[PDB]
């Protein structure tokens, strides 16, 4: 039954027990229920007034940590003889939570998530001699998924009629935006057991309703006579979080961001056929006190 | 008292005598879609006893080096009975499921099955970065076989798979498992031919063993849809 | 002793489970040592293309 739990529960004292018909330490794993044997029923306990709060394991606290989701370095220079596969003073990024594995395993502890995401953008610059670091203006434009993204630094898509842009400088504090809960469903599917199109040639596991959008970031300045290397780090913090149906954590290393494929490490720990590193026997104690 | 159980849905009934207390998934029971959560505005068809009835699948042979079996829902039932005809003639779909898994043997046999229902079991492939295709996922009535059930074929773990709605068939205790599933989706209804809400996984955690005469031990799966709605009537694909 | 007859399998199995009770408490949050990367994942550059 649902109740409000602010601290961990208290222990009551117990006595010698010797009753027929009552066996609380015996259980039934086969029902799928966890054992309800209390510590008062297994040993003799004392009264403990437990004042240990439980507020740090709240799902709001467990997930609302600003985590790196994007890291992109591009050369900020005059791009005339640069190849067309490079970032000519701007980049595009489809917003995902799959690329960096600390937030990914943490969000994949749940099947469904409903959250607002606040987005911190940290820009840092390095000289590509030394003459000083420029205080450049960057534009981060939020483009929805599948819409027209800019193809140039100076394209006319950067004018942002209805697309939300943030203009920010390197010497400022980092730019911070709140992106709302933007799914067309009532929760994001962290896992999607399906195909996202009506044909049999779509992608497995990728629901585009889960995708937030594109993040097109340019430098508004023109090129200086020297080049610079600009690294843009994007940080996501979930907030106002509801979470449903928890899952086993991922044990094997991630291979891709598109799928849940697995290889495992070559030896234990976290190998395919051995998640926990090995000991000599089942009656061998690894860190035995001498 | 909790070992005997008759499940009566439609014209189908199942009596069992060697069962456990059955599992309702996440404490929830199936229901129809209420008006304050509805999206599709046309009147749904609720065929009830024509579709809310047990559907028994093909049995699987529990053998020596079995790794496990999985069926995806509603994909395992999309071509069976009047459930499959309502699936193929409609665009939308909403139901829960009453899964009953049967496996018995003698009192000289040993073995344990983990009968676990997994929501949104997105699978992974082994030793490649190409995603699984359509035919790897949409098996249908026959279902599939686990390749690496120790990581649940998705890089996670079988050990922590008791966080999902599950039971056990330990052959010295029970011979059946029963899991009642509600609707488990982010959307209130769904297109049943491209998305699976539940995967029934049956996994040999303790293998089958005896020293008496060798009999075939089958594992039978009966699935009853519960509270079926169908929206978006058209032709059949 | 584990005592079986001649048609039971002479080697039997246990499965061990562990949970926490409701007096359990965790604090001071840190990143898990169970996951980590030394390179970008596959198709992560394709999110920039």
């Amino acid at each position: 039954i649902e109740s409000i739990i602010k601290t961990a529960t208290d222990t009551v004292k117990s006595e010698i027990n010797a009753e027929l018909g009552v066996v609380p330490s015996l259980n039934a794993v086969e029902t799928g229920a966890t054992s309800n044997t209390e510590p008062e029923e297994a040993i003799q306990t004392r009264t403990v007034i437990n004042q240990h709060g439980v507020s740090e394991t709240l799902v709001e606290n467990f997930l609302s940590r600003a985590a790196l989701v994007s890291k992109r370095s591009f050369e900020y220079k005059d791009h005339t003889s640069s190849a067309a596969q490079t970032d000519k003073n701007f980049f595009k990024w489809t917003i995902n939570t799959r690329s960096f594995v600390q937030l990914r395993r943490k969000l994949e502890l749940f099947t469904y998530l409903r959250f607002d995401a606040e987005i911190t953008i940290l820009t840092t610059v390095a000289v590509n001699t030394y003459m000083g670091l420029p205080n450049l203006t960057l534009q981060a434009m939020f483009v929805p998924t599948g819409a027209l993204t800019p193809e140039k630094q100076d394209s006319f898509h950067w004018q942002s009629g209805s697309n939300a842009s943030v203009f920010f400088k390197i010497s400022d504090p980092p730019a911070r935006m709140t992106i709302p809960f933007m799914c067309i469903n009532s929760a994001y599917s962290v896992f999607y057991d399906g195909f996202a199109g009506f044909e049999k040639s779509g992608l497995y596991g990728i629901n585009p309703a889960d995708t937030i959008g594109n993040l097109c970031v340019r430098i508004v300045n023109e090129h200086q006579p020297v080049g610079f290397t600009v690294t843009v780090r994007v940080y996501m913090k979930p907030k106002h979080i509801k979470a449903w149906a928890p899952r086993p954590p991922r044990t094997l290393p991630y291979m891709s961001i598109a799928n849940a494929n697995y290889k495992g490490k070559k030896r234990a720990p976290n190998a395919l056929n051995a998640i926990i590193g090995n000991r000599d026997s089942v009656k061998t104690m690894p860190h035995n006190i001498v | 008292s909790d070992r005997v159980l008759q499940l009566k849905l439609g014209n189908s009934a199942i009596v069992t005598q060697e069962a456990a207390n059955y599992c309702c998934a996440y404490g929830e029971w199936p229901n129809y879609l209420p008006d304050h959560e509805a999206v599709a505005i046309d009147k749904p068809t609720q065929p009830e006893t024509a579709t809310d009835r047990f559907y028994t699948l093909k049995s699987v042979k529990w053998e020596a080096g079995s790794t496990g079996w999985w069926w995806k829902l509603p994909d395992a039932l999309n071509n069976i009975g009047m459930f499959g005809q309502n699936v193929q003639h409609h665009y939308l779909y909403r139901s829960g499921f009453l899964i009953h898994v049967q496996c018995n043997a003698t009192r000289f046999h040993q073995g344990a099955l983990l009968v676990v229902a997994i929501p949104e079991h997105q699978r992974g492939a082994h030793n490649t970065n190409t995603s699984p295709g359509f035919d790897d996922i949409m098996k249908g009535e026959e279902g599939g076989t686990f390749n690496h059930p120790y990581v649940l074929d998705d890089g996670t773990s079988l050990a922590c798979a008791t966080i999902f709605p599950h039971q056990w068939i330990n052959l010295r205790t029970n011979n059946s498992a029963t899991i009642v599933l509600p609707w488990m989706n982010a959307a209130p209804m769904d297109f049943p031919l491209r998305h699976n809400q539940w995967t029934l996984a049956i996994i040999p955690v303790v293998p089958l063993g005896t020293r008496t005469m060798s009999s075939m031990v089958p594992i039978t799966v009966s699935i009853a849809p519960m509270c079926c709605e169908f929206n978006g009537l058209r032709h059949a694909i | 002793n584990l005592i079986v007859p001649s048609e039971s399998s002479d080697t039997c199995s246990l499965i061990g489970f562990i949970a926490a009770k409701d007096d359990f408490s965790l604090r001071l949050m840190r990143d898990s040592p169970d996951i980590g990367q030394i390179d970008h994942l596959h198709a992560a550059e394709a999110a920039y293309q």
Binding site: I1, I4, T34, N61 | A20, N21, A25, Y26, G27, I163 | -
Partner: peptide, 30 residues
């Protein structure tokens, strides 16, 4: 401190102390 006109702009809501472990630990019916 929320001077924005949208409700999702607010800070994190760390006051949800409602638990129900019995939907995972005792999901059996009887």
């Amino acid at each position: 401190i929320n001077f924005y006109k949208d409700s999702y702009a607010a800070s994190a809501s760390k006051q949800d102390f409602s638990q129900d472990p019995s939907k995972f630990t005792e999901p059996v019916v009887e």
